[model samples]
Target: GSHMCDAFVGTWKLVSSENFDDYMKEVGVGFATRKVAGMAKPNMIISVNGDVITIKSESTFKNTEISFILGQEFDEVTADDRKVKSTITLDGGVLVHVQKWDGKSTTIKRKREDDKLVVECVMKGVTSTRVYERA
Candidate 1:
């Protein structure tokens, strides 16, 4: 059964963003990288096969893909180039992603709301939100 993850298995196009730059800064991303990342709108593609899930982000700046099972940790090089240990799990239909590197960490929540994919990213106390519609 697709269960709680069914809503996330689709391609989503970025439609709007809020406080992304600040979130990047809080994550210690360089100024130049933050500038470029802030300007690029990425598309997210999610797919599931059995218990494994793959999430791919594509944009002109860069593309990243990760495949993992629920509650399992994997190595991930983020768009901003941070190498982190990442884990993703479903919590009541919302996808919760946590990344840890060095001594820093961040949390990202992806949820389907009103037919839109809403992503909320948090680092330290900074928070950013991005909204995506089906592509």
Candidate 2:
């Protein structure tokens, strides 16, 4: 059995984001291109069973699916899975997820960062972090 961070999964509404522009800056997102991604509509699914988890990042433009077993490799996924090749590791007791897409790698790390789950996505060298509270 696994513990699905059910509380955090289901349907998550995007509340707010952090340092996205900063992240864009780091990733070299030009002024003309920042508008689209900065305004990007993203949804995250955090379905955890015991210590295992399967997540989907969806939007109108593109979608990504990611799954992981605590303290192990999470490479076996459906061929339909696109976007990036990711790896997860523990850092200070938290789960760190790194997804590599195209020739670039986007690192989105998540775990219990207190009362809420802290999920940070770093793209094109820019780090975008978001916090999800149980609804």
TM-score of 1: 0.97
- Pull out the clashing pairs in model 1: none
- lDDT score of residue 60 within candidate 2: 61
Compared with the true structure, what per-residue lDDT tens digits does model 2 show for residues 21-103? Answer: 78766655577556666676567676766666777767663566666875575553322234445677766656677655557
Measured over all alpha carbons after superposition, the RMSD of each candidate to the real structure, in angstroms, is 0.7, 4.8
Provide the clash count, candidate 1: 0
lDDT of each: 0.94, 0.63
Candidate with best TM-score: 1
In the range 1-135, model 1's lDDT, one tens digit per residue, is 448889899999999999999999999999999888888989999999999999999998899999999999999999888999999998988999999999889999999999899999999999999999999
- The TM-score between candidate 2 and the true structure equals 0.61
Q: Among all windows of ten consecutive residues in candidate 2, which has the lowest summed lDDT?
A: 75-84
